[PDB]
């Protein structure tokens, strides 16, 4: 377990899923080449931008204590314990998965230090009676289930199946989806859950249990990334081809369709409404394993991505600028979270130190309660690295969440040379779909896959 620490006047924590789910041997195995590393580097880039920003903490240089959660609650809680060892840092911009953020908030509220998540959308995190020193730039996931139900009603998918992961993300997501589908005349065929320590055989059995109902031609997903990938692989191995409805776990991630791009074609997924940062790409492409010794996880990711071997010094010519780079739907959220923490610290400084620029005697002990209260209300700023067209700004509501907006993607272009997603609509206090971009939804190509108990029999002869 390696520690990444920066130097600054006041240090803030962070917990990023740099490594993937822990295997049976070690606590965590492979490196998240797209979620953990990219979000970590985006947080580092935004911190470097704030440290060079004269309007946001000009004289106060804020540091970092970013760590790896290893996609597991045990390792995440151990890193949060390493965080709270000082009070046993000021804030924590950390927590991707739901249960990770849950345990981190449980441990941090115990020491009264705030936390601004960037990927955990669980609804139970909005409970301020249980997690009061917690916030997030991503909105909760109970109206995300509303968007999924509205999409299902748009295509008249009544008899649908459900699949999710155990914990705090899949359970609440499935509950919200069922509550919003019972009100939209959409039925649940099979209500199931998947575990954390899984295998290929378990997902094959899950696909077999979902295949015994041929009427459920579509299954909604509230799983994580690895669970969705394993489910897609099991459906591809069992020759099961049916459209999916994915949550933020899959989203627009290309590592889920890695190898199983056939069984994932025409799957309507829902991701968070964001935008690609025009400056984070230039930062990540200019990264090298030798000029970025600040992060050893970056060296490990470089070694595991390009099939490198630092004991062989062979890949001294590779670079990120040569390979194609694609951001995420959460990089905007991690930069918004760190910028909101920085704006909160700046407002607290200008309120408690209205004369000087550096920290004062009343500022060195950072009170987490007053910091969180000054953050939830005295934070309203245009989103950093925002395009000139949109007017998006970071505003935390009464529950410390973000505005409710989602994008709807679909997997198309079965050609092996252009494997990609396609944004077909946006959900913002209402449903908006453009079926002209979906291949199977267009009537010229063919009818849409229906999922109902029985056929819509005509009233002329047969009654209902």
């Amino acid at each position: 377990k390696k520690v990444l620490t920066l130097e600054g006047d006041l240090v803030l924590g962070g917990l990023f899923p740099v490594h993937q789910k822990g295997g049976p041997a070690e606590d965590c195995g492979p490196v998240n080449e797209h979620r953990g590393i990219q979000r970590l580097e985006a947080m580092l880039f935004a911190l470097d931008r704030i440290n060079r920003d004269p309007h946001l903490l000009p004289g106060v240089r804020l540091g970092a204590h970013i760590l790896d959660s290893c996609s597991k609650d045990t390792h995440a809680l151990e890193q949060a314990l390493d965080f709270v060892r000082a009070s046993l840092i000021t804030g924590v911009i950390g927590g991707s998965y739901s249960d990770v953020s849950i345990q981190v908030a449980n441990l941090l509220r115990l020491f009264q230090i705030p936390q601004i998540s960037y990927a955990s959308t669980s609804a139970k995190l909005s409970d301020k009676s249980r997690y009061d020193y917690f916030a997030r730039t991503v909105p909760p996931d109970f109206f995300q289930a509303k968007a999924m139900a509205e999409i299902l009603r748009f295509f008249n998918w009544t008899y649908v199946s459900t699949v999710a992961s155990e914990g705090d993300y899949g359970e609440t997501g499935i509950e919200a989806f069922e509550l919003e589908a019972r009100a939209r005349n959409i039925c649940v065929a099979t209500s199931e859950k998947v575990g954390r320590a899984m295998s290929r055989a378990a997902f094959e059995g899950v696909v077999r249990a979902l295949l015994q109902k041929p009427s459920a031609r579509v299954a909604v997903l509230f799983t994580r990334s690895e669970d969705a990938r394993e489910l897609l692989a099991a459906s591809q191995r069992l020759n099961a081809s049916f459209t999916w409805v994915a949550s933020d776990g899959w989203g627009a991630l290309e590592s889920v369709v890695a190898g199983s791009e056939g069984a994932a074609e025409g799957a309507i997924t829902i991701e968070l409404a964001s935008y690609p940062i025009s400056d984070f790409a230039s930062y990540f492409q200019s990264l090298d394993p030798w000029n970025n010794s600040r992060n050893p996880w970056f060296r490990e990711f470089w070694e595991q991505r390009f099939r490198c071997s630092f004991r062989q010094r062979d890949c001294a010519a590779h670079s990120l600028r040569a390979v194609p780079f694609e951001q995420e739907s959460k990089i905007m959220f991690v930069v918004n979270a760190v910028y909101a923490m920085a704006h909160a610290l700046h407002n607290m400084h200008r309120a408690l130190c209205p004369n000087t620029t550096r920290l004062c005697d009343a500022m060195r002990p950072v009170n987490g309660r007053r910091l969180y209260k000054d953050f939830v209300l005295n934070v309203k700023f245009d989103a950093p690295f925002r395009p000139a067209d949109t007017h998006n700004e970071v505003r935390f509501d009464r529950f410390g969440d973000g505005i409710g907006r989602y994008n709807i993607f679909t997997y198309l272009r079965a050609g092996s040379g252009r494997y990609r997603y396609q944004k077909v609509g946006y959900w913002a206090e209402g449903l908006t779909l453009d079926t002209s971009l979906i291949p199977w939804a267009s009537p010229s190509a063919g009818p849409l896959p229906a999922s109902r108990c029985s056929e819509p029999c005509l009233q002329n002869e047969v009654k209902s």
Partner: nanobody
Amino acid sequence: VQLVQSGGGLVQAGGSLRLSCAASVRFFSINTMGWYRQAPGKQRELVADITSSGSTNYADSGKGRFTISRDNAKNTVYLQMNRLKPEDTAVYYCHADYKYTTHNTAWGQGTQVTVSS
């Protein structure tokens, strides 16, 4: 949902008082909203409640008192102190019932309502 309260007041016996309790909609169907009273370290007692449909109930000693009025537009409940007494020195709270897979009740902050001689 979050429950905000206003109108604490420090009045004597036989005076008038208005306690308002508001909430946030958040596209949630709050089906019941009422008031409660309790002392620090004791049990809570209902004093007034409305199910947003006309059914209104009170406490056993406040049948003719604790006039309440609510509306489904702003989701706000207003209570009036009809007749005061030195026995209601406890702090008051307002609750809101929302049914989203939990059937949970959301409470509010404390409002000090005390009546002296």
